[model samples]
Target: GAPPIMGSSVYITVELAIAVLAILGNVLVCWAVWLNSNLQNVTNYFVVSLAAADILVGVLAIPFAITISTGFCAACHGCLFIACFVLVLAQSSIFSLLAIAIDRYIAIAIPLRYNGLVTGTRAAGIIAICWVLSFAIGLTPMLGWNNCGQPKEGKAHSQGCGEGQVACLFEDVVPMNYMVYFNFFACVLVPLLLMLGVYLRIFAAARRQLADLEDNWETLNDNLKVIEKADNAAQVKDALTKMRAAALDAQKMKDFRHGFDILVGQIDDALKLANEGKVKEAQAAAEQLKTTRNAYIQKYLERARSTLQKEVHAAKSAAIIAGLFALCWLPLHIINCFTFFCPDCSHAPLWLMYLAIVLAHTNSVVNPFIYAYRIREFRQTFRKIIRS
Candidate 1:
């Protein structure tokens, strides 16, 4: 029961733009994934789940923005229920991203076992479980766990519905302590920790693989050099063979010693910088060392003799998507936790709250662009769809 309009025109425009982009982008991703045979895989299934959740956000965003602007039924329990439903969808998306991370970790870290580990049927089952869990979690408030009182006779009663209370609507629930702790732990904190651990392990495994490739490349070059020198010495004379072999051995040892010294020096510098709290410098040095070591490996692979380039690229893309998901959602969860636990904290300003919500919702729109459109095959498929 409020005015016909009530929000900054700029805010309204931004919200509408986000909603439209989320819907259109996610829909296109889903369509492309479904139509393209090459996109049918365990990981893509999880991606499709994420896209569906984003589409749900777009479907709900328009009505939610309208309700906020018009203040229509702003105090109704039904509105609260709808809000919870939307949250469920968002949580489903988060879990789906987690699923994708795990799937990729298995695929890249243990390619020999990925087929047995993450089959199509298993991925479908995981997606189903994620949605079911989301539904269960979101249904708690409606199932009498809320502080909002029941309706009486002709009047409806709900907590956090009075004037100037809409900002804190989510806080008014029965067994407040349990609800807050459970939501934070079960939905936000645990998933975040799990994804972080998985990503770290994935990164470690990728680095190890790269290091191994570099080592192999270095050994191959060293062997080639030794063989070429020995052959040249043999062509000189059989009488000087012994002397030339001894000289070649000494030269190889000297080169090995020099290379090892350089490696040790770089590592020492990196550790010194880390100990001095120069994290950026330390990381830069460490990355430089890795890059220098892998330079030959990269060139060798460029010859197109090995089949690892595509797999490496795929692993990198998976990591980027995981990192983006964390970046978008971490702030929202942190804000929610702070608002819930701080006894002296007042309701957040409307602008600040809207900013956080918009940021979280932005993930839905950005995912398709990052994960699907960035891929060559998906991009080609999308172009065909657009042209047709």
Candidate 2:
């Protein structure tokens, strides 16, 4: 009957559909984030680099890949440019991912220093470094590493390599040497490992801060308890007195003065009740003010609140995106393993191998969903855009 070459229609449509969806979702992520200052922080803004790469994969790279994947090697220049350009997009996406991991690690591991360390100009510089780094690694095949005029064997047959009218197939033009060594080992694996270590250290460092934050909340909760069970204004005065002593007690750094301001609070909540002739309500109002001061601690004490949430957000969604990138790309690298290190190793059939590439393309589209769901402010903006 027929060979796997006809499978191009199936593969082609899948990529095109992904291409459409990928652009929409990623464009949505960037547009949604850029217009909203809620996501304008340094690391989130850094995501713009990865977002652009994903958009390119969906736009230029996937379409270019289709021509070669489906077949048609009109001449030398066509396929070479296709392969080189597709690779530059691919590497840019992955390298940008690694950049995000590094940025996140630094931000979490040294919160204050990171502000000074990575300014807007410096961040742009780092992204430029990765873009050009990706370009160099991605374009090397055209320089000479490929098999364009070179000899080859089984599976490379249809590629027609006898000083050839070559089929422009990736494996035919791009050698296994670059795939396994420079691209897979150096670019993908090393960055994957570094992200692994950095994520671990962030969580390790994260554990220290997040662990202690429980006590801060516990302290607030205890202060709340002391308010509610005040034994009928006896401990209310004592609790208020205790807070006033510490808050008003110190000469008051502006931050600590916040506590003093809350405790004193112009006495409106309690006194207004007494003026209304509700002496009974006035007693309970004192209790209300005690709880009020403790309740407001949860709000105004942003310095303490910082440790609990942002890193959870910072690490979780990015790590989720990392996990997906590995899963999507891992099979392709393993397939490359057979091509490079062990020729005797069994290779997947042509249709299935292309499925792996399609899966790798999926990495771009799926990430926008992760951002939409995993991030809080991202979700907020996503809803705003969607609902309106």
Candidate 3:
């Protein structure tokens, strides 16, 4: 609900507009899997489930909230159910994210057993359990945990009605104790901590593998250096021979630095070996490039759990990491917990709380952007879907 629906048209449009994009974008992701077998992997199977939760938020939850304040809560139970449904989907989204995290974690943690252990059948089981658990946690308010038909200190329990009939609002039905302690702390925060822990372990394993690549590349550079100084055409016959000019520097992982942009400083005389009348070495250089690129990416695919298909998908995975999720949900949680924490000192401004709600809603919107922007398969498929 909002403050005076007619006056809050500005606010309504913002949220309602967000809903359409959220609804549309998530459907695009779900449909992408159906259209392209390339995206039909275990990771995307979890992604589809996550999209289901977000689709509900945009289509069912937000629209229901917008209608309530206009309708004056004539149906009190309907209002209460709508409010709890938001909690339901929020929990649903959390569980789906958890499922996604654990799927990736298992893929990275034990690469050998991943295919056998986490089959398509098991993915369905996780999806089913996620929804079941979300319903149990989120719909508790409807199961007699609400403040409905009660007076709260006789001050702000219910909203003012237009006539003599009693009107309903969120606080009139939903209890703040459940919001702060059960929903926020138990459901949201605890699970977030669990994910943070798992994501940390995933990062650690990924780092060690990257270090392995760095060291092995050093040995490769030394091989090129060792061959350049001494002639011996038999040694030169090793096609890995003419790499004297293009030494290994930062060309390994282009963005592997702590942050971006460290130049590789490799001279291109190796690139012009044919023009330099050294066509023999040039032919061998081309041959070595083909073999080495294939070999290195194969090793990388194994080490990165084959979650990386084309391009730097590890960078994209880093882009979609959980830190940004924690950022969006925190402001709203702070607002929800404000009444319990500092009511006596300073009350939360109504406008501020509305903004917090908007921010929370925006998270559903960002998921699709990350999907299409970084997941090149999604972007290429997105273009195909558009062309038709």
Candidate 4:
């Protein structure tokens, strides 16, 4: 029978709450993305995949806590299999988020070619590969590559193979050290560093783009001022020349008119030539400005089509998810590595081990909230759905 509600029930309640939240929140995310035409895209497809994986985490992993609390590992093989299945789902979630980051990086860094490079069909293929790899990693233990040792009937289990010893139960068969070096490099370190590098390049490119726009704007302003000054100079020279002509004597008015007319025609011709030169300069300047404006508009349209701002927000969320994943899982991973490398080291307490497991599980529950907070479209859709 389940225990009565009390302070001791706090952990169970938390676990149950996380399970419900993970399931409901991720389901809504998947539903909203799928139903809303505005949300349909290659990146959103990855997000949907992430939500599905989290949903699996909620379904398969949260119940394991009950098994832990009840001390019910009646079938150790079944427990280990479920554990591997949950691990695969969590890994799929991680890689799906990574795929989103890569998509954003490609879209922002090489926007002109992004359509050709990251098509929906290709993204689907990549997502399929991610899941396939996750399944392969998860199934290795079940396929006899693990260090769980041979099962024996009516015999006590080894220390490392006991209940709540999930992490340390797997041993490396390959020379590359699967428990420590391989897991750390493959799961944590590589993905973390890769995301960091991609975001860094994105920011760098944005800064350069902004700087070039500013420089072009300044050049356009300077050319406009030059055009205005040239027009003003031409007007002032015409006024001065006409004033001198009006000051000629009346007695010599006939000859003066002829000479004045010729002088005026010459001045007019010179002024016309000068105005033509200015017009050519102005036209050249205007053409340069038009080219710059067109380029700016093209870039703006490209960014809009790529949904650059949304992608940036998504990147930020991905970073937070990765950071949280590392934070929540790294301690357990480190301890596992330590225990694997140093056989004489004391094992972690059951409570601490359970705490680490709970922390890692929190990631699946938290990601939906992150998406809601960071993504405007998702948030708006959520609100609309709730209202309806």
Q: Output the number of the TM-score-best candidate.
A: 2
- Model 1, span 263-318: residue lDDT tens: 44554565566556655565565445454335433444343224455665776776
What's each prediction's clash count?
3, 0, 0, 0
Query: Which residue window of length 10 is worst by lDDT in model 3?
Result: 258-267
The TM-score obtained by model 2 is 0.75
- Candidate 2 yields a Cα-based lDDT of 0.72
Once fitted onto the true fold, the runs of candidate 3 whose alpha carbons sit more than 4 angstroms away are 1-6, 74-76, 152-166, 213-312, 315-321
User: Per-model C-alpha lDDT, please?
Assistant: 0.64, 0.72, 0.67, 0.63
CA shift at 376, candidate 2, in angstroms?
2.5
Give the per-residue Cα lDDT of candidate 2 at 166: 59
Model 3 score (lDDT): 0.67
Give model 4's TM-score versus the native structure. Answer: 0.71
Runs in model 2 deviating more than 4 A are: 3-6, 151-164, 212-253, 257-306
- Residue pairs with backbone overlap in model 2: none
State the displacement of the C-alpha of residue 58, model 3, in Å, after optimal TM-score superposition.
Answer: 1.5
RMSD in angstroms, candidate 3? Answer: 10.1
TM-score of each: 0.69, 0.75, 0.72, 0.71
Candidate 3 residue pairs in clash (backbone atoms < 3 Å): none
Candidate 3 vs 4: which has more lDDT: 3
